[PDB]
Design a protein around this ligand. Structure first.
Ligand SMILES: [Mg+2]
Ligand SMILES: [Mg+2]
Ligand SMILES: [Mg+2]
Ligand SMILES: [Mg+2]
Ligand SMILES: [Mg+2]
Ligand SMILES: [Mg+2]
Ligand SMILES: [Mg+2]
Ligand SMILES: [Mg+2]
Ligand SMILES: [Mg+2]
Ligand SMILES: [Mg+2]
Ligand SMILES: [Mg+2]
Lengths: 58, 240
RNA sequence: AACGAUAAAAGAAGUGAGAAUCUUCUUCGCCGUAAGGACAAGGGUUCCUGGGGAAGGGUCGUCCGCCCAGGGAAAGUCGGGACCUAAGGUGAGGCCGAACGGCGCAGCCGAUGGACAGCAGGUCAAGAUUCCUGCACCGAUCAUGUGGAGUGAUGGAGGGACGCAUUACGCUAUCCAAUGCCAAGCUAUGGCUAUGCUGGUUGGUACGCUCAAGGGCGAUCGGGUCAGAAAAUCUACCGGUCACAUGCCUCAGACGUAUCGGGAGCUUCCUCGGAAGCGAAGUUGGAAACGCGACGGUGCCAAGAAAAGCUUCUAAACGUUGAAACAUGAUUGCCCGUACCGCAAACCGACACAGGUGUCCGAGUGUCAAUGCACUAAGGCGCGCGAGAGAACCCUCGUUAAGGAACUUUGCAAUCUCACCCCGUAACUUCGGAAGAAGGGGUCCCCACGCUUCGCGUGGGGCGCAGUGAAUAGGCCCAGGCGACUGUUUACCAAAAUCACAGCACUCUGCCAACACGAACAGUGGACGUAUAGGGUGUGACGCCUGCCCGGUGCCGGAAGGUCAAGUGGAGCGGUGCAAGCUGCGAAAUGAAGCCCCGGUGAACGGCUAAGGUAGCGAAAUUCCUUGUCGGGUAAGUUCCGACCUGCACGAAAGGCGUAACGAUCUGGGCGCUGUCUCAACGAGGGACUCGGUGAAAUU
RNA sequence: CCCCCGUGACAGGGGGCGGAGGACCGAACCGGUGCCUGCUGAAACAGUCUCGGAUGAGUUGUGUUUAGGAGUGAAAAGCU
RNA sequence: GAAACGAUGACUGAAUCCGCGCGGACCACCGCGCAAGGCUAAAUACUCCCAGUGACCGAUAGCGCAUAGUACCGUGAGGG
RNA sequence: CGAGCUGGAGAUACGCUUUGACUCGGGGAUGUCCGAAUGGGGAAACCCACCUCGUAAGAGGUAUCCGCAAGGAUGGGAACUCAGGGAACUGAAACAUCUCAGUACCUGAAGGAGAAGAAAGAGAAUUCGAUUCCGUUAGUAGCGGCGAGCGAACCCGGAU
């Protein structure tokens, strides 16, 4: 059939214990010095399109 | 070559394969032949041309009767294009002339012989087939059939002078299979190649044979197959 | 884990709640004898338009072949039926059968075939040989005229009516070239200024004293009835009379004139995009069919549907005072199919699946040719997850020092070889072959000169490491085993040394043939055959050959006798009744095929007791011992070759021995070449790894 | 088939021309040799490459016939 | 089986009322019956349908179906 | 029957109805095309005809099997009935007669039922008086590789 296969149902503890590293990491947010709405570091502020001056439209 | 019937291939009877093998072949048209000749008694005909007929092992001649009507007749060994032939009791013991056995002298070599005065020819129709006239008995005549059987045939039955044509089936070597295919199916399939299930010979561990039997039941070499029949009495000396 | 081919994609613009994915634009890359286009089958509305956005879509969707609504499909001439017949089906009567049912002459059903009248353009969002415009043709009923007497079947005959290969002449479709014509413009990077560049370059019909290959044809009088059931003026058979080349009849197509059509583009309006109006040129030359002229020519054996329409005839029958045939105008025009996909995401494969699917068309350049191969037109696609990374390991690849089979079950795998031309070419042979044997040289460009080109030959010069410069593209040889040979087979582990084979034999069968299917005295296959034919079995081209043994088995042959069934035949025994009777069982002898018995038969089962192996082969596809023994080849040889004979256990049509040629067979050897190996390395791609989206399975 | 030479017991040998073949090479087409890949596949039998036939015992559509101890079979107990 | 009687596919083949069959080889007797012509209600079997009832079921039960021979699988019959 | 109706359908609109709708009970008249199917053909539901009457629309007929003709049969039925034909698994701890069983199945005819039925009978009393069904007789008598196993009938009691 399917050459290598599992030997027992992996317990609720053991199965969950594995997901101990699946913990999503929330973005490190900074507020734009202009338009004042959050933005990700080293990127352009979504709201105005500023990044010292204005680059992107709307 | 002139106004004939359509021959249709068929090797299975009312549905099932009856006569084993038989299958390929270039397609043929049936030529209507005058075997009896009886109604053309007294009237002479001229040999228009000898011809090819793939239905027979012998060649065929074309007769043009004095009344107009043409008939395909069997071609005898010797008959030339443009030779006169007549039917009826009043006829020469010369090539092609059709006459009954009483008027046929002793020793005269004939072919295309009936069995009942009527119906038509039923003996010596193949190539080079000859009937020896041994002698007269009563209203019957003793004759030697191509095989060597001495049948009592009534002197009232018609015949044609001479032996049949199409030389000899010898320089006819076939050659390679396919020749036999452009006629009838893969031939003689060995029952020894078969299986216990298929044919008595079949089985074993190599090449063999042990009892000597045909497809279905019987026994193949030497075993008289004739019945204890009526026609036996109208026949003297069989073998070969 | 996967997201279904390694044919890419990129950016810009738009839309939208939301966009890698939908739209438009410009690039890119992929197919192009297809991955374009046209049918058929099959599917069924999937086609178009306008909406939608649960589910379906291997991701996302604003999108679709999906959900909804509306529409679209037009025929006297295309396919089919009102026409015809094949295989087959069916079949009043007729033949068989426990039944139900099985057969069957005529007839009837049945396209896969025969027959048959329409072309060219235009154009919905979606149909077009159907609608529309232009100009045709077909039959039918009648109307006016012509003509002035036949018309001619349910029957005759003629005719339709037929293969395969090879091929001459002319031709178009159709394709190429140009300082031919026509149209638009411009070009600049260095140049060109047009003799450059790009595009187009004739389709339908009518008429002609125009060119024309090829193709098709004999006419008439008479006689015999004995032939077409009969008739016939028709057809056939025989005869007489003008039949060589000529001569009639046909023009495939080409040309000219006209006319309708189209035609590169051009012109306005534009409602984000279409619509209406206009319209230039038409040349010279080369190629060219599987289409046409056409039922041509020749060669061949394996000897190549039928029926109707159709053309010719009389029988009947109506009428000669209104014939058929012609001509022109009116009229007439039935039923079904027709959208759409259709080598595929709409069909069969459970899937939007790397498979399968019959027919047609399928351009250009280069290339002996070509539907091959590389690029490419028209046209159609990038294959419905994506983005980074550049580990192990996996697949699919490229190169590799020296070595070159040492790998290994085995050169398995992969190299090498590769086309066309020229030279050259063995053993052996069945005289054909082996043979592309082997081996060698060439091959690009330019100029001159020679010829038969689409090019080729000679001479001289140039360039590169290299000239079939890329793609398609045999490695070869020595010996053996088996089978002759082409072929065939285990759909899905066996392609072979199996089966078939031409050739050989033994044998059975006399025709309502043996033999086979079958309820059957049916019917049929064998066969519309007839022993130079048909069945069965074995062997297996060809060459030389096929020994001995008939006791057992089987087949064929004999009868002097033994055996042996029902039945004929009743001697004798017994039951009951007073009795005549009525009753149970009943020998002898006679009574067929078989079996015992005698004889033969081996290309019958067989044997090497009935006899003990004739050649020929032999350690073999057969051999235990065994890696027999000596020789060969190797540095070394359980295999291979060759002798030998001690054949555990070869041997003559379960054929013996040998054989040229054949082989995706099997074994052994050599040359070549090589990552098969010493012994691995580096490089590419696709997974593997990482993010975002969708998210299985055995197992437990 | 037409021309050319040769007579030892000989056969044909040469040219022309023709256009044979279960002939060759090779696409379509029909097939399935060897390896690898695939092996909860793209796929209930395939893929790339390589290989066999390729005017014949050839391939193929449509229509129709033969079936369960029955059919069919260039013969494996194959296919139905 | 000592196998009567019915039945009849094959060959045969009679008596006619001091006549014929029967009574479990066969005989005598004793006893029961008139074949070889037809017709014939009712009591019995069943439940597609109908009505009534039930120590019958109540949605994995009960019909397969709270309705469906449908969806779906199969060329098909068939299955569901 | 006596006020509602306009089917499930929950759906709006037009309406109909005490001159008695609707629904219920009972007759009729229509009834396309297929289907025994029946003019002929056919891949059911579609093709193609002819004869008659008819102004076209339209109406009727054209199959065979019996008998003069009236008139009768063709096909369809859940099970039940009878007739022609007639398995195996299984039991016999194997299997062959036997069993399963004249069961399953196929076929023909038929009806509301059928079949059977008026003693050349049952039978042992010189008793009975057409048939079917139930009880019983009775696992008796008997059959039987006398093995597995199969198994009556008269009498009597009823339904009729
Ligand atoms: Mg027939
Ligand atoms: Mg990736
Ligand atoms: Mg990083
Ligand atoms: Mg040898
Ligand atoms: Mg071979
Ligand atoms: Mg081969
Ligand atoms: Mg992920
Ligand atoms: Mg090749
Ligand atoms: Mg080859
Ligand atoms: Mg519940
Ligand atoms: Mg139901």
């Amino acid at each position: 059939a399917k050459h290598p296969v599992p030997k027992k149902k992996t317990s609720k503890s053991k199965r969950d214990m594995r997901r101990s590293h699946h913990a999503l990491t929330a973005p490190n947010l900074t507020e734009c010095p202009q338009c004042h709405g959050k933005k990700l570091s080293h990127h352009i502020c979504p709201n105005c399109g500023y990044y010292d001056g204005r680059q992107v439209l709307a | 070559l002139t106004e004939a019937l359509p021959k249709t291939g068929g090797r299975n009877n009312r549905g099932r394969i009856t006569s084993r093998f038989i299958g390929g072949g270039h397609k043929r048209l049936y030529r209507i032949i005058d075997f009896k000749r009886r109604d053309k008694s007294g009237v002479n005909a001229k040999v228009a041309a000898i011809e090819y007929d793939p239905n027979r092992s012998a060649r065929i001649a074309l007769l043009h009767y004095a009344d107009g009507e043409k008939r395909y007749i069997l071609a005898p060994e010797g008959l030339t294009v443009g030779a006169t032939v007549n039917a009826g009791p009043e006829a020469e013991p010369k090539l092609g002339n059709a006459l009954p056995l009483r008027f046929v002298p002793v020793g005269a070599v004939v072919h295309a012989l009936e069995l009942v005065p009527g119906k038509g020819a039923q003996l010596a129709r193949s190539a080079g087939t000859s009937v020896q006239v041994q002698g007269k008995e009563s209203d019957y005549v003793i004759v030697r059939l191509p095989s060597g059987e001495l049948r009592r045939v009534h002197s009232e039955c018609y015949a044609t002078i001479g032996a049949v044509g199409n030389a000899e089936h010898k320089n006819i070597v076939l050659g390679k299979a396919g020749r036999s295919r452009w006629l009838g199916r893969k031939p003689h399939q060995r029952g020894s190649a078969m299986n216990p299930v298929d044919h008595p010979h079949g089985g074993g561990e190599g090449r063999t044979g042990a009892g000597r039997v045909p497809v279905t039941p019987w026994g193949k070499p030497t075993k008289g197959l004739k019945t204890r029949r009526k026609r036996k009495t109208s026949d003297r000396f069989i073998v070969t």
